[PDB]
Amino acid sequence: RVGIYDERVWSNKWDRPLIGGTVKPKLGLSPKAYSTIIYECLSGGLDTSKDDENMNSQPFSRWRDRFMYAQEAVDRAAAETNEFKGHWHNVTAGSTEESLRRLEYAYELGSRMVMFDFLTAGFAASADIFKRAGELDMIVHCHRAMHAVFTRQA
Amino acid sequence: DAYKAGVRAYAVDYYVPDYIPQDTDLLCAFRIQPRGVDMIEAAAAVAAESSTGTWTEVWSNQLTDIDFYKAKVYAITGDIAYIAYPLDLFEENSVVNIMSSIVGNVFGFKAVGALRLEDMRIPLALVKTFPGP
Amino acid sequence: DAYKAGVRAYAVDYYVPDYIPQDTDLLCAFRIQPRGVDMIEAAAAVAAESSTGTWTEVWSNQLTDIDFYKAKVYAITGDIAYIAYPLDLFEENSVVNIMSSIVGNVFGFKAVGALRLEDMRIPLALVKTFPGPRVGIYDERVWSNKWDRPLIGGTVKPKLGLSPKAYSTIIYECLSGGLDTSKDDENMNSQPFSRWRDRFMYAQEAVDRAAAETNEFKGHWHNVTAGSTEESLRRLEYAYELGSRMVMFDFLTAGFAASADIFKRAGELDMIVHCHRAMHAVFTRQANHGIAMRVVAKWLRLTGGDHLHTGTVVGKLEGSWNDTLGIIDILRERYVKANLEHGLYFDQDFGGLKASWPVASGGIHVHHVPDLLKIYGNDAFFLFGGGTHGHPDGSRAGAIANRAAVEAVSAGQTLQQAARSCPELRKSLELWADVKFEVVQ
Amino acid sequence: AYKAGVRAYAVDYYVPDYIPQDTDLLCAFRIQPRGVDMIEAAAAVAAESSTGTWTEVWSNQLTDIDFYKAKVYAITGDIAYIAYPLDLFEENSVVNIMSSIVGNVFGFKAVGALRLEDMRIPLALVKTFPGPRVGIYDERVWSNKWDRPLIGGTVKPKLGLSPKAYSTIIYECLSGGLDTSKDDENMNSQPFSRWRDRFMYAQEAVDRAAAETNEFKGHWHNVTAGSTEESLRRLEYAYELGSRMVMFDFLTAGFAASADIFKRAGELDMIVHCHRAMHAVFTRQANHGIAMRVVAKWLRLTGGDHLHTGTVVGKLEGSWNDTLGIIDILRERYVKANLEHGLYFDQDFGGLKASWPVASGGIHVHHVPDLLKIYGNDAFFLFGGGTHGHPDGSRAGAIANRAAVEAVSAGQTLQQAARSCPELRKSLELWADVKFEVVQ
Ligand SMILES: O=C(O)[C@@](O)(COP(=O)(O)O)[C@H](O)[C@H](O)COP(=O)(O)O
Ligand SMILES: O=C(O)[C@@](O)(COP(=O)(O)O)[C@H](O)[C@H](O)COP(=O)(O)O
Ligand SMILES: [Mg+2]
Ligand SMILES: [Mg+2]
Ligand SMILES: [Mg+2]
């Protein structure tokens, strides 16, 4: 839907690589702590931040808390830098229906982008996720988790 | 100031041969072919990079209790590494989430030339969240 | 021909003192008053008629493995019967199903003159099927930016009879004056004197005004309790579209099933649900018959209430000190250890589910704050209804006093210290100095 | 007129000169005062269930407290009679009635025990409720069964049966002569019996047994579930299988969910059988709680088609004269006050349909004469153990229970009937010595 050129247009960023970063530690961070890191790293100069591929919804970080707090940080950091900022909320979930649900919430928070583990969820769910994101004018960042299980050995 | 920046071996914090697995842990049996590091180090990288860790120590590790959430290599018998994952690391009712952690990035690490997940003990408390047939 | 028709004693197959409870069993502690049969027989009937058995042997018992599915009286200590239920007996994610078996028919048996469920060990594998609270304690502190102190609220009074506009005037004054939240009375729903759309809308404008004017987060727990789950959802959604971040629900009078739909929807709508325990004393209060409140507390937290009334101890409503401490821990902690001094018969794992706010309410005033803080600490709500609107100078001044009292004690100072700088609080201290209630440990 | 501070509740809420009105909702409370005289304790109940609190609030001047307040208008010994103005109640909501009348007053330190014995729901409020969809008469019409009790039975063991085994028992007992069978109240959906399997297999059995007997047959599928939405789902599936009836644990699920379930079932032309699981937690002891008679009024108004009422003679507690009052509450248009039957007030039901009383629990063939004496024809008698506990199986047990009810219902005695029916002779022999206490 979006691709390279239109994202440069949406974000007004040209003639350089875009810079991002995964929040760490991979798991175990409260949604509020998560937002504090997202704030610090986007304010420091990152173009985007992202959930880890295995951050979905868990007892330590339920997806609605993390998404909401993360997008607050994005917007606080964008306004204070006068620069487009984004965080790739991970909508990967145990079913296509639930992934679409998480995508819809990210859209309503104002997010222009999400993250999706397209191989672990699968190409069938990916097709539906891409189609809805394109209707919601959103970027879908695709994480290739699991690929090395069959792409590694020659 | 528990924060010691820089790179350490994964085994410092992820190799715990004294760890006693609990009925709520998700257990994995991994067959490992190490490449350029110890068998213990190879196992500990698989454990770290499928739970809480990354390649260098992060200040943000002090914002949570790593020792609680981290995966633990509790046994190594030959080239089989037994790793335990706390229940809290997993989304309920989601094989997809299990995949994303256990087989998400660790099979492409340079420090392992080959990796095979042989088996997994899905704890009963996580089984009950699934519908089955 | 394993089928021996006719009546046998329940104990033949349900009294198993050698049984070793398993981590997956649901355990119950029952206080039994036998009537016309042995203590063992009484326990075995409770076990049988809440699991697999009936009054006479049925041929159909051979169609399944009774020894696997049957409940087991594995211990009897005095008049306390410990009974274990296999996990397979329960529907996942359903307190309603737990109720239907454990407290469904056994309290009306002729062979027991009195029965009281004291506690229940819900096994972790069944806990994990429940959602628990959406917001809970920590995230509500984040939403409202209120830390290191109890939060303070208060029921609008009089209970019934106030018009919607008069209600919002009281809400504005007590919020502006220092209360963090205000609430509908549990029996304010939609009545001729206050139809619910009128009350909801005026109350939320008072809320928004107070918050802007004070530069503090404020809220009002709109009561969405109604005669119908559908109607309750309609009132929750209206509260949402008004911009409310919170409502209340009489979860026991409406019912656990309804409560489940309501928590689910509130959670999708990013709203707090304050849970009022109206009706509970109909079965939680008498020590020899009924369901202990701690059990209700477990069921409420799993189902997903964000707040739960747990008593004052020192106010107008009955409640024991140590009993209240055990209920507090059940709602706030991850793992609770058995402690019979707090009425906890089993260790209870809550499996990472969010915590619920304990709520202290009913007949309390400024003088009770030191005790209430010793009981609850900071992670709780103290509600002052008459204690706010009973102030000689009105609701705003009562709020000033209560807020000044709670901030002071919570920081280490005394009501007497705080009173030096606050006249509103001196009047509250003076008015109710000799108003005390029975205190039981 | 605002005087701050604590005043006694009786100053404003003890009004022995008050004349109850036909619009007032009236309550009879049995009170055990604690640290206060009976009058103060009854005044506290009235205030804290209507307009009052523990201290005088300035906002009392913003409305008409004398108009909206409850009034303790009479005291007879340990019974306080309290009148509540109609305007205090939301229309068509038992939930609201409970919120006021039993909300908080049962936990006050100023009473050691409190029992709601009866409540007079004014006709103006009664007329806002739908009452049952089907009721007694139309069910006799739907099933073409007249001039006798209907006979049913719970499948046993309570839990642990495969859905297929379940269907085998339902087949045998309905074919043997039962009018209806039912899930146990705690059979919802479990690892041993998922609801879709059991419902589907159970309704197959119903239809096979109906066709082979040329008689209407039914099984009460239990749609009780952890949420109203899921219960509605199970109700919809039972409807699509062709079932004309379901079962619902109305108190454990709750009156809010019950209202939605009754409304959908009435749109789907289905009977809802209401199981009162949990009731004895607060209806048992005379000291404290809510009398079952009040629960019966609430259930009938909300729209339950059947309601378990006790056996008196079976394994569960229940006094004869009390059960007669509950029965009249469920079946009659106008109940007359009668303290021998525990009825403190006349109750008008405003032409709402009647609910079937349901006798169930620990009863067998020998109990049938007493049962009909208590209930007469318009009732269900339910034999669970008394059917599947037959020496020869569920079919023979149903044969016996059907013949014992048919016989007594006609005028014959058990032994007259028994001489023709050997299955009944075996039931009589097996359970001749099985008796429970009987309190009148
Ligand atoms: O109706 C009332 O009495 C209250 O509004 C208290 O008013 P005041 O503040 O004026 O007392 C609360 O609902 C009760 O505290 C409930 O009891 P509990 O908290 O025990 O459930
Ligand atoms: O679970 C039971 O015990 C029953 O199936 C009886 O089975 P049996 O026929 O085998 O005894 C009924 O649900 C109870 O009678 C309900 O009690 P009540 O009608 O008093 O509410
Ligand atoms: Mg990653
Ligand atoms: Mg109240
Ligand atoms: Mg039953």
UniProtKB/TrEMBL annotation, chain B:
It comes from Candidatus Promineifilum breve. Residues 13-124 form the Ribulose bisphosphate carboxylase large subunit ferrodoxin-like N-terminal domain. Transmembrane segments: none annotated. Belongs to the RuBisCO large chain family. This is Ribulose bisphosphate carboxylase large chain. The gene is cbbL.
UniProtKB/TrEMBL annotation, chain D:
Its EC number is 4.1.1.39. Mg(2+) binds at residues 182, 184-185. GO terms for molecular function: magnesium ion binding; ribulose-bisphosphate carboxylase activity. Keywords: Lyase, Metal-binding. Coiled coil: none annotated. GO terms for biological process: carbon fixation. The modification N6-carboxylysine is found at residue 182. Pfam families: RuBisCO_large (PF00016), RuBisCO_large_N (PF02788). It is an enzyme of class 4 (lyase). Residues 12-123 form the Ribulose bisphosphate carboxylase large subunit ferrodoxin-like N-terminal domain. Residues 135-431 form the Ribulose bisphosphate carboxylase large subunit C-terminal domain. Belongs to the RuBisCO large chain family. This is Ribulose bisphosphate carboxylase large chain. It comes from Candidatus Promineifilum breve.
